[PDB]
Symmetry: D3
Subunit: 152 residues, 6 copies
Amino acid sequence: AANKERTFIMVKPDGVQRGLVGKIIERFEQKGFKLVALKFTWASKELLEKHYADLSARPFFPGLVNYMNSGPVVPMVWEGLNVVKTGRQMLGATNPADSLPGTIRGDFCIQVGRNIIHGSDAVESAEKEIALWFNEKELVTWTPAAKDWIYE
Amino acid sequence: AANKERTFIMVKPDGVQRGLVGKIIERFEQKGFKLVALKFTWASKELLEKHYADLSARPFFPGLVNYMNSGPVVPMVWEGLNVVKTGRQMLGATNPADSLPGTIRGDFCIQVGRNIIHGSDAVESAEKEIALWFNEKELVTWTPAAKDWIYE
Amino acid sequence: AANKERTFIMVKPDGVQRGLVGKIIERFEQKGFKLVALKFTWASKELLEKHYADLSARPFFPGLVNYMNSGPVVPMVWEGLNVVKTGRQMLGATNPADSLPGTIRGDFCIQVGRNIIHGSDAVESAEKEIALWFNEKELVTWTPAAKDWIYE
Amino acid sequence: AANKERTFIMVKPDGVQRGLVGKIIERFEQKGFKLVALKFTWASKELLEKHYADLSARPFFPGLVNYMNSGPVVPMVWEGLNVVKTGRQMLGATNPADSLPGTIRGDFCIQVGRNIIHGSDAVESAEKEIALWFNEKELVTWTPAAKDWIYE
Amino acid sequence: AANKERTFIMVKPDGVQRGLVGKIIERFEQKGFKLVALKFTWASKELLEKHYADLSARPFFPGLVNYMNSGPVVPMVWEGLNVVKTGRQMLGATNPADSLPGTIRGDFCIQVGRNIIHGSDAVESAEKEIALWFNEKELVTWTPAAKDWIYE
Amino acid sequence: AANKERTFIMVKPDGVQRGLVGKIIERFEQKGFKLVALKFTWASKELLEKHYADLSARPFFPGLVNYMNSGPVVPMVWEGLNVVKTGRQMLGATNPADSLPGTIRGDFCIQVGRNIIHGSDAVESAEKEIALWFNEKELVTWTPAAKDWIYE
């Protein structure tokens, strides 16, 4: 129930370009979270406008959609107790300048427009993002051998 | 075209269960190789027997297909000059016992039946494997920013 | 004197099971702390009940003892300026979800009941714990060659 | 010009003696910061007192200059958006005791007098320090291939 | 049975002094070998002379014993399929200069007289060494949760 | 005498561009070798033609001089027992395709014209290269605290 919460994590074009895919996945594996879905893909503007629908009436929305469609991305779904919230703590503050050393953004990037990764900000939106990026078919259910040493 | 050679690499169920996905991906990214495709999935037996078609007459063929259908896998495609042969060197000998330290199998596993990873043995087999596991829609073509620093 | 303070650090059953022993010891070594004692053992309930004597009346007490007796543990002693306090900081908050990235619990575990490690909460309790877990003969006294580059 | 800010970072004698030069450099490279200058040298006292001019009235000033002249150092300049302040965050609090895990001092050292590294505290001091330690001939101007993936 | 083989691995005084304890243990853990015994101790000459009994007549014998008695050591027991032989492979050649990169000696040391680690040369000698260094009571028997993903 | 042998190691333009400076230095520090000189610089064609004088009458010499003058390089001098020979083993085969995993080239690059690093091939040429790249002033003499644990 609580251990079955899921979040959407995506490596952005700059994360892929800078060779940080393996490193980012390692952080989540290490922590004990469970990989549920993963894929390498070039997001379409139609999909990005959906993903960024809330930036619609904000200045320079097109430039955001064009940047995000400027290279391949790595969408993922991780499962675990409090993964949405904990996953965001792990990524660090959205604005890299505010990210602490030890977090993904704090260790690997500098500017907010090139902040290498995305993570759902709430359970509700994680629910929305996952359904937008993956078919229920792409979500894999399995059981880790070490499950009992991770959760009581 | 030389630098465009592609090979199929797959993290087996034991690799996923032991949390080695990011580490394996990282070895390829740091080397200079280009990720072309990636997904997390549970392989069906019908797909496994195709993938294993060559071992059809083998007495261990049934248990093999059986084992590979016992947990999720991470198939992927990497591109780069001579990647089939070099990808093989990186993985190390098929029997971990012969794999040298520094290789993936040599560093992370012990026995042949739990050798954490698969790699195409030749271009002709890489082509078949890639086509077996991926649809052409899933192979992403993009250009790494450091390409001229990797290849002349 | 201040530099001779010691604390008791112990890898719990889940840390051993999840293969974090070397990683945890590494964190203390790279920091500059001196290893004073180390062993691998399966702790008896008698011993665990003395270690947890203060919680004897709690309703969870018996469950806690059975768990700590469910797998081997790695008890150790570290020495250095303010090691009890700094030791705690390096471990992170007891509840991993409150542990920040960069700490041992922040990077490697998720739930409080599976929080992989223990560290004395005070000089007083560290003294008590060391006496409980080790004999005088097990505490090694030596001098690090890098001593003058770690301390003024 | 924003992204062209520069700060002075120096590996102190204890950092060199403890073999932390590559690790320190790696933290800056992975973050996205650009190396502008670097050298290995034994600093004279006359240079140290200039570098430490501000602490002239300090009772610990003499021993400080003394200590910093006791082994070789690795001065360097890094460039990047907001590098003075961010470089400071990365290093962690000046007193390692207050430095958090994840920072350089928090992860690698224990006491203030052996705090392995120096970082400019402000732009005005970075400018002076850079000019004190390096000749203009030694500051290299070049462009990283991934610049557009780090800054917009 | 074949999987129950054990070997004796010991970190020498120089490995402890150079802070390689956690790194060395890490190599064995990530590989899949099971930790059976571990301790930190200062070895007596009496004990060292029994460990090196075969070299009693060599002219260097006394110098070797004095050196091995000059700092604490970390004796341990590892268990797994072909561990004595694979253990040796992971350590590299006795003389570090002949040790290949990726091995423990190849990556971390230089001269034969300061070769940081020891590993039994055969099943026969491993049995003898374990009895010399540990009591029956110090050998821990447990089952790794990942066992079925390491062995067929 | 033998422990005082030195070699010239230089990170090439592609090594700097790919952010491998810290990593390469770490390998040498880790091994136990001693840093004697280090600097970040843009090599002049006049200096490169001297360095590559033996490629004079070979095809496409100019293209080599232009590539090597296409970005900053990191020249270094390391000191240690058999450092020239051992340093070359650590770098791996010149042609990356022949480099074994575990070596610098085997882990980080692909093609011979983009092989990230240079190392003197003999004591005689190390002697020549060092004098070409550094003034006797730039060579720092110091003594590591751990010297006695590295050499007998």
